[PDB]
């Protein structure tokens, strides 16, 4: 997962070439991380060893 | 910088683009992630970057 961001600024260049860009961020700022269950990982990685 | 503090992984970059009419340039800004911007310079010019 990741945290909140405000919105996607809509900027038009020349003949209608709309593009989006990351604007401001509200409220606080955090990560940017992934979570994995340990006990499942442990025995799965061990079973890899036995085979 | 952000309304509640600052962020280290992004930069706020002032732009220099064309309007919808090919006669004028206008000021703009967007935020980008640090790893996608390179300081294209012949020296340590921290105010000149390129996508």
């Amino acid at each position: 997962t990741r945290p909140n961001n405000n919105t996607r600024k809509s900027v038009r260049i020349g003949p209608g070439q709309t593009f989006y860009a990351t604007g401001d961020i509200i409220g606080d700022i955090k990560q940017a991380h992934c979570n994995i269950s340990e006990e499942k990982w442990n025995d799965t990685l061990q079973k890899v060893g036995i085979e | 910088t952000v309304k509640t503090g600052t962020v280290e992984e992004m930069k706020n970059c002032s732009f220099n683009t064309t309007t919808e009419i090919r006669d004028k340039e206008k000021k703009e800004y967007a935020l980008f992630y640090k790893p996608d911007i390179v300081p294209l310079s012949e020296t340590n010019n921290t105010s000149e970057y390129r996508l």
Epitope: P3, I26, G27, D28, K30, H33 | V2, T4, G5, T6
Partner: antibody, heavy 126, light 110 residues
Framework: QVQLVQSGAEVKKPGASVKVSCKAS????????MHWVRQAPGQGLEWMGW????????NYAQKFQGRVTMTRDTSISTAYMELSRLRSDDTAVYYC????????????????????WGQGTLVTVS | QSALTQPASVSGSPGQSITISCTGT?????????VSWYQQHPGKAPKLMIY???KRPSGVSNRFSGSKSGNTASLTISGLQAEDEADYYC??????????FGGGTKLTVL
């Protein structure tokens, strides 16, 4: 135990400013948010934003737009509010209250859990 | 973006169960579950009374309950005594790192 020691009451002229502080004790203040509220004698409770103790980032509520600033000092575990451009409408009672636990992995500031509050202080404008 | 609507005051005979309601816009309480109740005795700092309307905080006796539905929520107090003579406030998360506190309501005893 978790205590919040505030400063004494004060009265100032219109247009002046007053400094309000709140001191933490009994716990590691660097892991919890801190919010503020004002209450006039007969009105509701107006909420002002939190101040992060570590990075020092601050949020402010609407209807201030900079007339109030918030700062901190981690060496003595004390927060300070600077209330500028006082008017007669600012006559009220001020309190500090401790917020939720800061987790570094998700936004938790929006959890209005205030279990420990200071004794408060009176602010009057002449 | 105004405060939450609250009654002015409530009353009740000793023992009587009392229900207090708070009404807001779905953007506040219909969206999330971040709702809390506070009570404050005149001349004292407030005390927290409710977590997650239907969750009890620590240090609270088994006299307070509540629930939410749609755009409103309420608190129920059983076994009314003189000790419950206090002011009550609702407050909830607004989104955008903001919090709403309600107008409040005064409890009277008979």
């Amino acid at each position: 135990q978790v205590q919040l020691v505030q400063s004494g009451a004060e009265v100032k002229k219109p247009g002046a400013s007053v400094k309000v502080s709140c001191k933490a004790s009994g716990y590691t203040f660097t892991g919890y948010y801190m919010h503020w509220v004002r209450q006039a004698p007969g009105q509701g409770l107006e909420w002002m934003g939190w101040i992060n103790p570590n990075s020092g980032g601050t949020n402010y509520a609407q209807k201030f737009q900079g007339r109030v600033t918030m700062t901190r000092d981690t060496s003595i575990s004390t927060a300070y509010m600077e209330l500028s451009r006082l008017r007669s409408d600012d006559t009220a009672v001020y309190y500090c209250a401790r917020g939720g636990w800061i987790s570094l992995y998700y936004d938790s500031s929006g959890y209005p859990n205030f279990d420990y509050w200071g004794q408060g202080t009176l602010v009057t404008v002449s | 973006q105004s405060a939450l609507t609250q009654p002015a005051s409530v009353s009740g005979s000793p023992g009587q169960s009392i229900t207090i309601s708070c009404t807001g816009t779905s953007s506040d309480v219909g969206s999330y579950n971040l709702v809390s109740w506070y009570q404050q005795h005149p001349g004292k700092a407030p005390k927290l009374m409710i977590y997650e309307v239907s969750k009890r905080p620590s240090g609270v006796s088994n006299r307070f309950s509540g629930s939410k539905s749609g755009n409103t929520a309420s608190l129920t107090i059983s076994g009314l005594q003189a000790e419950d003579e206090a002011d009550y406030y609702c407050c909830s998360y607004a989104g955008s790192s903001t919090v709403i506190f309600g107008g409040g309501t005064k409890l009277t005893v008979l």
